Amino acid sequence: DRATKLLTYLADVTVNGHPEAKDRPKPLENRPVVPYGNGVKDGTKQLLDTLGPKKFGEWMRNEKRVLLTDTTMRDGHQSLLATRMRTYDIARIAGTYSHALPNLLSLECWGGATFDVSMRFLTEDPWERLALIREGAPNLLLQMLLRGANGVGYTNYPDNVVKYFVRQAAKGGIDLFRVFDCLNWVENMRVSMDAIAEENKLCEAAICYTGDILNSARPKYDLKYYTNLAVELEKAGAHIIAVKDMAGLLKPAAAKVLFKALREATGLPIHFHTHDTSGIAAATVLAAVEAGVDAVDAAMDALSGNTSQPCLGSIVEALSGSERDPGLDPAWIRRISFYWEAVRNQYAAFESDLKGPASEVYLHEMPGGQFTNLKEQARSLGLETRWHQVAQAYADANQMFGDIVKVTPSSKVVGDMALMMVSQDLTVADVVSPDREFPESVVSMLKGDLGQPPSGWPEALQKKALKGEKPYTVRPGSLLKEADLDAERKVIEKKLEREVSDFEFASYLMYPKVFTDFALASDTYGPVSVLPTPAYFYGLADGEELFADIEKGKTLVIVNQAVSATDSQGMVTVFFELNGQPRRIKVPDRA
Amino acid sequence: DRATKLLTYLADVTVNGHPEAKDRPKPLENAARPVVPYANGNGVKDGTKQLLDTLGPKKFGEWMRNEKRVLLTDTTMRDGHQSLLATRMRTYDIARIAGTYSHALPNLLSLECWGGATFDVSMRFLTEDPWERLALIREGAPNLLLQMLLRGANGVGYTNYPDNVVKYFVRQAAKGGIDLFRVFDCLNWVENMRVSMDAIAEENKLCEAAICYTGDILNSARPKYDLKYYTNLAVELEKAGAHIIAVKDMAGLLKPAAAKVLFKALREATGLPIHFHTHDTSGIAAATVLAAVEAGVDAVDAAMDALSGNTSQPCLGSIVEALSGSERDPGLDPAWIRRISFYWEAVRNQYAAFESDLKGPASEVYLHEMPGGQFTNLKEQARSLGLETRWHQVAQAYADANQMFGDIVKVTPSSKVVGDMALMMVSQDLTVADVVSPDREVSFPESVVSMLKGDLGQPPSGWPEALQKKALKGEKPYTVRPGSLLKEADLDAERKVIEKKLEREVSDFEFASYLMYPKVFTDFALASDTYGPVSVLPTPAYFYGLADGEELFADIEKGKTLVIVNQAVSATDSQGMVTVFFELNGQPRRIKVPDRA
Amino acid sequence: QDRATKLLTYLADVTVNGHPEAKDRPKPLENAARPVVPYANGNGVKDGTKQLLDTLGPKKFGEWMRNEKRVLLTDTTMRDGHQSLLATRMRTYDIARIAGTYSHALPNLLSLECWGGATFDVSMRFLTEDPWERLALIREGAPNLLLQMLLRGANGVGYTNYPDNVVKYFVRQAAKGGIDLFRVFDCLNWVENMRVSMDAIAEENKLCEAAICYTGDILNSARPKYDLKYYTNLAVELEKAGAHIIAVKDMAGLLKPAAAKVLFKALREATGLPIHFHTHDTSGIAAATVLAAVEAGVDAVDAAMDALSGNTSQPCLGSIVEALSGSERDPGLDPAWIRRISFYWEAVRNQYAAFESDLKGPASEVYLHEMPGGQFTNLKEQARSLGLETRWHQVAQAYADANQMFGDIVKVTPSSKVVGDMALMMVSQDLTVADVVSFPESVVSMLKDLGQPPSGWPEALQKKALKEKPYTVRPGSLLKEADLDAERKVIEKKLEREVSDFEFASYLMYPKVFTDFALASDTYGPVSVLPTPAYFYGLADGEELFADIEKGKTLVIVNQAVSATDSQGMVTVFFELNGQPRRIKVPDRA
Numbered sequence A: 001d002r003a004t005k006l007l008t009y010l011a012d013v014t015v016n017g018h019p020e021a022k023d024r025p026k027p028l029e030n031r032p033v034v035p036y037g038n039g040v041k042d043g044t045k046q047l048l049d050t051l052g053p054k055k056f057g058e059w060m061r062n063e064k065r066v067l068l069t070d071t072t073m074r075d076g077h078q079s080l081l082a083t084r085m086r087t088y089d090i091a092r093i094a095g096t097y098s099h100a101l102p103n104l105l106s107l108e109c110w111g112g113a114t115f116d117v118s119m120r121f122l123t124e125d126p127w128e129r130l131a132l133i134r135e136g137a138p139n140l141l142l143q144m145l146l147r148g149a150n151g152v153g154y155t156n157y158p159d160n161v162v163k164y165f166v167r168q169a170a171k172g173g174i175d176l177f178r179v180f181d182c183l184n185w186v187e188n189m190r191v192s193m194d195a196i197a198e199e200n201k202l203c204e205a206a207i208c209y210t211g212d213i214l215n216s217a218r219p220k221y222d223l224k225y226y227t228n229l230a231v232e233l234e235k236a237g238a239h240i241i242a243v244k245d246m247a248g249l250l251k252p253a254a255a256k257v258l259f260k261a262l263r264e265a266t267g268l269p270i271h272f273h274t275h276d277t278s279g280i281a282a283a284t285v286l287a288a289v290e291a292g293v294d295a296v297d298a299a300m301d302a303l304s305g306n307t308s309q310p311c312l313g314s315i316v317e318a319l320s321g322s323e324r325d326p327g328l329d330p331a332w333i334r335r336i337s338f339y340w341e342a343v344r345n346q347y348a349a350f351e352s353d354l355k356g357p358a359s360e361v362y363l364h365e366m367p368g369g370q371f372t373n374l375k376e377q378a379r380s381l382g383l384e385t386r387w388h389q390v391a392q393a394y395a396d397a398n399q400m401f402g403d404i405v406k407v408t409p410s411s412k413v414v415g416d417m418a419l420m421m422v423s424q425d426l427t428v429a430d431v432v433s434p435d436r437e438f439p440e441s442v443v444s445m446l447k448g449d450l451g452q453p454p455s456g457w458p459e460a461l462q463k464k465a466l467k468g469e470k471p472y473t474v475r476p477g478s479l480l481k482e483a484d485l486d487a488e489r490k491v492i493e494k495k496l497e498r499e500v501s502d503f504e505f506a507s508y509l510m511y512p513k514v515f516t517d518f519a520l521a522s523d524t525y526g527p528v529s530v531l532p533t534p535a536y537f538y539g540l541a542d543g544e545e546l547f548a549d550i551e552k553g554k555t556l557v558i559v560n561q562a563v564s565a566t567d568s569q570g571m572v573t574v575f576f577e578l579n580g581q582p583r584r585i586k587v588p589d590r591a
Numbered sequence B: 001d002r003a004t005k006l007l008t009y010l011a012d013v014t015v016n017g018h019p020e021a022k023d024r025p026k027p028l029e030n031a032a033r034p035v036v037p038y039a040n041g042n043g044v045k046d047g048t049k050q051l052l053d054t055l056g057p058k059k060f061g062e063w064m065r066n067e068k069r070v071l072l073t074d075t076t077m078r079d080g081h082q083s084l085l086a087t088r089m090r091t092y093d094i095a096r097i098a099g100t101y102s103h104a105l106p107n108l109l110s111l112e113c114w115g116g117a118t119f120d121v122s123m124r125f126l127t128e129d130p131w132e133r134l135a136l137i138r139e140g141a142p143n144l145l146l147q148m149l150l151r152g153a154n155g156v157g158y159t160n161y162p163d164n165v166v167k168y169f170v171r172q173a174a175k176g177g178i179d180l181f182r183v184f185d186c187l188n189w190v191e192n193m194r195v196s197m198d199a200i201a202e203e204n205k206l207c208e209a210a211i212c213y214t215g216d217i218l219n220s221a222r223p224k225y226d227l228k229y230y231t232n233l234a235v236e237l238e239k240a241g242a243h244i245i246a247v248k249d250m251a252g253l254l255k256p257a258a259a260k261v262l263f264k265a266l267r268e269a270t271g272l273p274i275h276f277h278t279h280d281t282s283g284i285a286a287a288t289v290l291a292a293v294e295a296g297v298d299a300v301d302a303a304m305d306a307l308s309g310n311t312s313q314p315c316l317g318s319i320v321e322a323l324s325g326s327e328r329d330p331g332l333d334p335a336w337i338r339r340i341s342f343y344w345e346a347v348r349n350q351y352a353a354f355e356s357d358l359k360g361p362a363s364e365v366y367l368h369e370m371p372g373g374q375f376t377n378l379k380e381q382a383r384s385l386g387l388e389t390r391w392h393q394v395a396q397a398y399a400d401a402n403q404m405f406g407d408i409v410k411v412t413p414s415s416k417v418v419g420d421m422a423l424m425m426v427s428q429d430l431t432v433a434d435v436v437s438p439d440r441e442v443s444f445p446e447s448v449v450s451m452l453k454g455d456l457g458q459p460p461s462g463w464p465e466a467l468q469k470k471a472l473k474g475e476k477p478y479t480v481r482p483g484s485l486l487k488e489a490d491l492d493a494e495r496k497v498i499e500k501k502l503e504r505e506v507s508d509f510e511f512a513s514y515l516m517y518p519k520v521f522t523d524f525a526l527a528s529d530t531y532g533p534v535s536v537l538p539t540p541a542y543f544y545g546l547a548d549g550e551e552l553f554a555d556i557e558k559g560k561t562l563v564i565v566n567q568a569v570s571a572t573d574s575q576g577m578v579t580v581f582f583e584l585n586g587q588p589r590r591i592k593v594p595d596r597a
Numbered sequence C: 001q002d003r004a005t006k007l008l009t010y011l012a013d014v015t016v017n018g019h020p021e022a023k024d025r026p027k028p029l030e031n032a033a034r035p036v037v038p039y040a041n042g043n044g045v046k047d048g049t050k051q052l053l054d055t056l057g058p059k060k061f062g063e064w065m066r067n068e069k070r071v072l073l074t075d076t077t078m079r080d081g082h083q084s085l086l087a088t089r090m091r092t093y094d095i096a097r098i099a100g101t102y103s104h105a106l107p108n109l110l111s112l113e114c115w116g117g118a119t120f121d122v123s124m125r126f127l128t129e130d131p132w133e134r135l136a137l138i139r140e141g142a143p144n145l146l147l148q149m150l151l152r153g154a155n156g157v158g159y160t161n162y163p164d165n166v167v168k169y170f171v172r173q174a175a176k177g178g179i180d181l182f183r184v185f186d187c188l189n190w191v192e193n194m195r196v197s198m199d200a201i202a203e204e205n206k207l208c209e210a211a212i213c214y215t216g217d218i219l220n221s222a223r224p225k226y227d228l229k230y231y232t233n234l235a236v237e238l239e240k241a242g243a244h245i246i247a248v249k250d251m252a253g254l255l256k257p258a259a260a261k262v263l264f265k266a267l268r269e270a271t272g273l274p275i276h277f278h279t280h281d282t283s284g285i286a287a288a289t290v291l292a293a294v295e296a297g298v299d300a301v302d303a304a305m306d307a308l309s310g311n312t313s314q315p316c317l318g319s320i321v322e323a324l325s326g327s328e329r330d331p332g333l334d335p336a337w338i339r340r341i342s343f344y345w346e347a348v349r350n351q352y353a354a355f356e357s358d359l360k361g362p363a364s365e366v367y368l369h370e371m372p373g374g375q376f377t378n379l380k381e382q383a384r385s386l387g388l389e390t391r392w393h394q395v396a397q398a399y400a401d402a403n404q405m406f407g408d409i410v411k412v413t414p415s416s417k418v419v420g421d422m423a424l425m426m427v428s429q430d431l432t433v434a435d436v437v438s439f440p441e442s443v444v445s446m447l448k449d450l451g452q453p454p455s456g457w458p459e460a461l462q463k464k465a466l467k468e469k470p471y472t473v474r475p476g477s478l479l480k481e482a483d484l485d486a487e488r489k490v491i492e493k494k495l496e497r498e499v500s501d502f503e504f505a506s507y508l509m510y511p512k513v514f515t516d517f518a519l520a521s522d523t524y525g526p527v528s529v530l531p532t533p534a535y536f537y538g539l540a541d542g543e544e545l546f547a548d549i550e551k552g553k554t555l556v557i558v559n560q561a562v563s564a565t566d567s568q569g570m571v572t573v574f575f576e577l578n579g580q581p582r583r584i585k586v587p588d589r590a
């Protein structure tokens, strides 16, 4: 039966294809090998257990060597592969990171688009993924990107929902929460941060970077602005401060100034996250290090560059022998990279067509993790040939909103506006016109659903968009009614005809429909996450042999022997051998 | 009749495909043609070319040194597509953009646009004349230095040439429009650079003598290439007459911390200006470039965004953006840089057949040290031999081979030797120990034997004795400069040879071509006779011909524009011929070509 | 069973690779109804000619045919019919199934021609089935009708002449196997070469029907060699030799209506014996000669069921009967049952699309070449083989030219192949009868081993051909009598078991062909039990088949899936046999 359920998924996929793969490129027909005895060395995880989050923050500050966060298991594939990287490929390498690179600060491996996408697109539980990484790497900190008032979603939630979620995340194994607000609005962060401290985990409050601190003609976003935000987040009870350069806009000179000034403004350690879209982010990371930054993010070489993080192996190599040398073995970095390379090939279906660095990022400000996405939508809305006008629209739409931080979800809101401008052939001057008579997302933002910029929203655009609906300027969750968690849990148990887990109730609070659809498919198809990635996406070619582990003990030998023509009722029969026993699995012909 | 030959080319490719493109990915069927950007319309401003002519090469070098701003060289027209598109970039696309560079970016130091692999690949794979290319660039950008890579003892070839031949080619190159010669020897052997350096100066042109970078000056476990190895060479090259010293970091090995130290030291060891070339394979070469700039380097190379990154140069627009407003701000408009880059992106889309499968940065570069321009090629060569799933063993054997040869500068042509050694080691399952084993017969590759014999010159500490003795199978090696053993070419006699083969007089340029590439040039000349001036065709037509019904505009001369329509194509006849039915300017033309399937 | 296993192996081997005889030929309409055996009226079978022959014996039975007023009928559908139209590929499955229906619906029939000729050879070599088994099955289906074979005389059932004791031995077996009526012919109308066979048929107490092969034209004075006296002498001659019945074997369909009125008056006046007439309808007028024969008082005639009649076959049974219906010689055969059986043969025919010729209809050309109905199409594909399709009418002129060269001879198996081989070559090399007078194996072998023509062979032609002394003695006398006890041990040592008497007869006739068949029997089992589509095309994907492995055991075989070709060359067919999953590996021969 465990086996039966899987065999049926392997029949369906073999006969019909995966919807996400069926007409995108296929992988080069001509497998990843986990690298090849000791126990594991205590690391940052044992240290955090010893010191607690406050003192641990202090230990980072005092530490001479730069500390490294590896973003491969989250941001890396979120930016390069539409976030389609699977638990199977992520879980299998954790033990290797654990044994081979025990000096790492943390693995960024959760939150961001992974929660959503893992269920909705990859038919797998994100809590299962977290647990398996926890078991693989008991000596490293596990880091998530947490979207402040948004959790792992796009709408701002009731306070208790946010509270509940952070509680279960901590229980699932998150040690380090990188929390951010899409308008750098500290008031909208106080709920999540307090929730993190109350779990006794690391609250790394982030400041999103935009504009250019060294351009006097763009004064909205200068030095003071960042340094004051820092001082505000310390008072707010942060253990660490992050600079989140979501679009890779921080230039090297700017880093040199920024990180001096930040460390003078606060005693807290500083953590720097950036993207390589410009093709010089590594210069900025090195600059940051030279100015004394406490911790930096990079991605394994094979999933680095462009819209991802800059190259981990190269940055480490740049520092090796220096006062701030991180002490990571370059030969082990390569071995793990060669693995991710072999992993990456399996996702040929999800490669963008981005060929290299673009200094154009300084014009549009699209976040690394939005870039490809917004090119896909433009191709979808038929605008492929006009893509550069869309970049111009983004920036123009950005000025219109009064020059704002564009990170999730405010970035979609700008995206949505820019596409409408190019489509409906509209200028900003038309957009503002009091007479030239808006995406749901835009109206949402302009009322006050995602908070307030420093500016305040431009009054003329606002009164035009809202047309009737008076705006609110209070903090969103201070209007949302406190979800009846008791009463909202029943609804998902009479819809699934069973008790769920606290973790499951969490997935549901965040994504009612996506979790629902996931639970049904899961009762149909079984533990599909244990299937290797080429089997998950393409089934089993004829005569072929597959090993899957359904639990701790049992390994299954699954062989596709044969696949019949289609019968009278529209069915197709796949003939299997499961551990030497003959199996026939009928699967409906969806052609 | 030049129309007839062009139609014959179009028919052949229409019916049979182009051998270089037939079995590779095709461009998107949509495909916006590249649009030359509209320019404001103000004149061309005097730039570095006028200054060179005024000052002569020596004082101009001085001018570079004294300039506070950092000087940029754009590599897009040469190293850019050598590294990323197998050098297949065509004259049509290269020359169409020169005027834009000229009007828009007048402050550039030079366009690197000639030499390296372009000389050979233009004739061999593109059926076009590298001198014609240079002439069109010269005419479009009369205010900028035109720059070439010149291989010192190998000219634009791969083998050693007689002195008089190296001297002759350099004279033609100067005449053809080259202003700035980056000249390098693959073993950093100054003795072997002297003839070239002297020839460049005798032409009153810029001699930018290069030091190749390898290893790590900051790693005291690798002392052979320490700081003083570079500063000694810079002093030696100056004595030898350089106007400019280049650091040629062919594999992108130089790290930022090392650049801080190297460029400060160089500019103290010599008064000449310094020019820094690197490659972005590591994914951090821009950090090294900005650090070089911080440290006072005079010029740096970059490639236009759309042809930069990975094995190419680091991104030009972003480098420029990061200097914007600094003390050494290079004075280049990034709007215009982005416009020229957008053109290059459309141009590059046409070359889908030649894209590699490289995904991004690789710190593995610090291990293998493969030059950026070799990487993709070597990997194709490995695939060729069934070694695709063992690429990383090839990269490891390449490192091991480097050490076995005594740890050497790896760049054309010495890099190809190490590559040959590596491929053989992986195929035949041989460790370095096996390679030098007394009990193991090993047929060494020809490039390896030749190198240990002396043909490529002398590394600073000689060739490892036991390896050499084993590889040479009794042949006696030499330590003189390989050119001093070559017979002076009988220039008069040889010119007569090619003139009798082609039954016509050739120009001096054509003759230099022949001197460097006798077979490839002859072949090219025979193709020109049959097909006419195919370089005037747009790139899709050149690689794919015309689809059924398709209308193409083409300029056979500056005078007229031919309108060509593919009206119909016949079945293969009993002669094995296919008839293409063209309209040329409303008139019917039936062209017959062979069915080559 | 392992017999079941063997059938699956075959079914898999044909499903994956096709039948070699069918794979590159036309395929039955994808529509196609299963032929349906008609439910015949009642319970028992009316005694018929079989019971009469049991009671009376052969001589007296001959007298009874003579005396009978009604015309008697032989149905040739089971033998000559598909030999002429379908290259003798008709299967036992289809033949056996209909026997009982004949037995109930047409008890008045004289005989079923159903054995002999090319069937013996072709059933084994091309159909992978036992001709004796086939005979037994018809015997069981029709215990009231006579069963008739064609016997090539001294050639027996092969193409060469055999030892006397082999001919004797084979005929003994044919009797024990169920044949009641033997039609014996010599390919040169040579009675001395017939004497052994007839004696042997008499000795086994079955009907000796001694045939006289018709050729030329008794009514054309310009061709006197085969005049009326020629035949009437041969009729009187064979009566001395002990015929129970005299046949006129018109192998080429050359006898014309006016010639029939004369020939049959004269014959019945020459001999007391009944006369049986066999013809072929290549002219498109043979029915006319049949009806002329009846009116002149012939005792028995041959016809083929409507659906396998006309052209190179026999003339139409149903139409001949309908024409005699109500006349004083009315054969007493239900026209509606003939049509029911015809509808059946029509559905059976459609299954053999692979073997249809492109013969369009009647050809008066037959009077020029004289090619036997059974040869015509054969020799035309053969001419095709050698790129002569375009010069086919020249190949016909060549055959008639060749015939005159040999001296205007009786052309029929195996003398006909001999003229065939000659004319083919003659065209290939562009050679006149003047040129001819380096040969094919069989042209020199006849001039030496087929027997003697009434005048002898042409002098110069025999000399320039044989290049070695010729003989005139009966071939069966110069062939030392085969050691029968020795020869048996040989086929039994090779086949690692003793064979039955019938099987030793097969081996004696066709040593190589029987040997290969036995081996195939051991490998594929009783394939003859499969229905015809299955035997030639296997089972479609998901097709359900019902097959009778034996008596009252039906197997339910379903082909459920067919795997890709595996690394070690094999292919795996996934059967369900009687609800039980089964896996059969066969090699991809392609």
Ligand SMILES: [Cl-]
Pocket: A510, A511, A512, A513, A514, A515
């Ligand atoms: Cl949902």
Ligand SMILES: [Cl-]
Pocket: B516, B517, B518, B519, B520, B521
């Ligand atoms: Cl050459």
Ligand SMILES: [Cl-]
Pocket: C509, C510, C511, C512, C513, C514
């Ligand atoms: Cl035989």
Ligand SMILES: [Mg+2]
Pocket: A060, A061, A062, A063, A064, A065, A269, A293, A294
């Ligand atoms: Mg620190």
Ligand SMILES: [Mg+2]
Pocket: B064, B065, B066, B067, B068, B069, B297, B298
């Ligand atoms: Mg300077």
Ligand SMILES: [Mg+2]
Pocket: C065, C066, C067, C068, C069, C070, C298, C299
């Ligand atoms: Mg009668």
Ligand SMILES: [Zn+2]
Pocket: A075, A245, A246, A273, A274, A275, A368, A369
């Ligand atoms: Zn990010």
Ligand SMILES: [Zn+2]
Pocket: B079, B249, B250, B277, B278, B279, B372, B373
């Ligand atoms: Zn280079």
Ligand SMILES: [Zn+2]
Pocket: C080, C250, C251, C278, C279, C280, C373, C374
């Ligand atoms: Zn017949």
